[PDB]
Design a protein around this ligand. Structure first.
Ligand code: PCF
Ligand code: PCF
Ligand code: FE
Ligand code: FE
Lengths: 309, 309
């Protein structure tokens, strides 16, 4: 039984959307008219039962109250899909950039501590592997851009991010590094762990029904931007991780894999500001695009922890 | 730019849905494959911006955390739409019932105090108008059904429901009345007020953008069921309410309007177990349908406050 195609019902969705008056935005009205016609068709095409419909509405309350809506768009590949479409859109406008882009994720936090060229990122709490992170920011041509900001955040060895994990100290593993004259950034930190969604959370309960896992490879998030250049959201995925190419949020891309190198020496005392038995080294450069508007460097208006806007 | 129609993207949604393995439910897989193809098309057909997309994901967190998902399906006419489809479905199976059905609403609470034939519903707290509620439960033929349960709940004079409003006492304005030999129920209570959504809540902020109001007429909710009869969810809407036929959840239907009668007498001392100056009287009967399965009386599995199932 299909009633959604009758004028009787199109007239009803019409008034729900608000086309019954002159207040509100003629934009949502068009979007809600659409969201309603489509929602109705699924229900009629897949014959969703009342029980299915109401468990969805309720799941939706729980997804909301654990605050995992961004985590689910990510797990359903919706976030990756947007970058694909952003890419196809750039192909048309002929904006063949430098470093590829990849999903942002739901765990960013504004205003992290700021530093010139060098910074240590960890609070010296963990039994991790020190990781030395370094590279340059490049221009459209292949040149050093002094003064670009590389905004980075990553999980700790337990695989969690500060701020959401209260056990962690303020902005742990979170910093804004300013590139120096040679356009480089240096970061002393720790190898982050891959992580999974909360096993008893809304996102995973959905993935379970999909028969899917909710794991991600060890990675490091970046927000890179420079006066007169196009803002870039990307990640460095660590080489060798079991999930490198099986990420539940499908963010891993070619050219986005970091090659990690291990240096072993019980006594790394002299030679590099280290001390012993082992540490990681990783170098990765970002190449930006010429901006063609202030819009270019500006981050989405996506809401984020602490941007208080 | 449309990429959603390419095999490259259909293959991607395919693996997201979980068709990449043998675990999970082949049902969600089909539903999520669909929810993803459609979501993608809106984005491509209405050219939703990244900012729009991410404010929606965030709105979705707030809708979840105030727990108004049911209140929004109601405001967008989604709940009414289901009863319409349930109706069209009954027309085919030739189930031309008694009293029409109408949306349940998001504020039911299980296990309310139980009573034989008569009960008082209020805790004697308000400066309301006493309301006398009475009627019978009828069979498919027009006869009294002794022993049917009429499960009712309604707002108080401030226009709120107990349980969600902590200021109210336990199960205030909430009861399960058992019909007597003559198949009737009697209820001494108070005239409820119409109510609006929370003005600074997720639902209303949406309706605002639709230019719409979030008000409902004064009403009384009913769950009516009897051994061997089809369970009915309905409302009685009070006559004369400004919003009788302008309900933001579109529940008002013909044959669902209660005709309220006012009796005035400073001294209603003797004659009816009253006392003075004014009270309301309302009589309404429910006519049920022959059940043709236990499914018939069983309430949806819709999750509800306290059913602890
Ligand atoms: C307001 C707009 C809503 C607009 C929505 C319009 C379209 C609605 C389509 C909804 C399709 C969702 C499928 C739900 C099917 C259902 O009836 O239940 C699904 C599962 C639970 O299934 P179950 O495992 O059999 O549940 C019983 C568990 N016991 C109690 C035994 C322990 O419970 C779940 O929580 C799985 C749900 C995951 C997906 C939810 C949908 C997300 C929507 C976005
Ligand atoms: C996970 C699946 C999501 C799947 C979703 C896939 C399709 C997504 C289509 C989303 C369309 C939602 C329109 C949002 C457009 C937008 O950019 O903002 C909408 C409004 C705010 O608009 P504004 O009033 O200009 O905001 C600025 C307010 N200041 C800061 C000035 C005070 O903010 C709002 O909160 C209005 C949103 C109401 C409707 C939300 C959609 C409900 C979805 C179900
Ligand atoms: Fe992450
Ligand atoms: Fe109500």
């Amino acid at each position: 039984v299909k009633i959604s195609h009758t004028a009787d019902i199109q007239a009803f969705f019409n008034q729900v959307a608000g086309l019954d008056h002159a207040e509100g935005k003629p934009r949502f009205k068009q979007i809600i008219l659409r969201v309603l016609q489509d929602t109705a068709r699924l229900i009629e095409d897949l014959e969703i039962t009342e029980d299915e419909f109401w468990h969805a509405v309720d799941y939706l309350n729980r997804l909301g109250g654990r605050n995992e809506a961004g985590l689910l768009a990510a797990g359903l590949g919706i976030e990756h899909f947007l970058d694909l479409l952003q890419d196809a859109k750039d192909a048309e406008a002929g904006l063949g950039g430098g470093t590829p882009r990849t999903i942002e994720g739901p765990l960013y936090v504004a205003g992290a501590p700021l530093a010139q060229g060098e910074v240590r990122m960890d609070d010296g709490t963990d039994p991790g592997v020190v990781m030395f992170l370094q590279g340059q920011v490049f221009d459209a041509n292949g040149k050093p851009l002094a003064g670009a900001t590389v905004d980075l955040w990553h999980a700790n060895t337990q695989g969690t991010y500060s701020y959401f994990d209260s056990t962690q100290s303020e902005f742990n593993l979170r910093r804004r590094i300013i590139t120096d004259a040679e356009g480089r950034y240096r970061a002393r930190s720790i190898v982050p762990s891959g992580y999974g969604c909360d096993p008893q959370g809304p996102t995973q309960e959905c993935l379970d029904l999909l028969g899917r896992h909710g794991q991600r490879p060890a990675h490091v998030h970046f927000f890179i931007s420079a006066f007169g250049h196009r803002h870039l959201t990307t990640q460095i995925n660590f080489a060798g991780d079991k999930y490198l190419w099986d990420d539940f949020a499908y963010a891993t891309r070619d050219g986005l894999i970091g090659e990690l190198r291990f240096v072993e020496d019980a006594a790394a005392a002299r030679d590099r500001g280290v001390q012993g038995e082992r540490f990681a080294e990783l170098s990765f450069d970002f190449r930006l695009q010429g901006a063609q508007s202030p819009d270019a460097e500006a981050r989405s208006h996506r809401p984020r922890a602490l941007q208080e806007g």
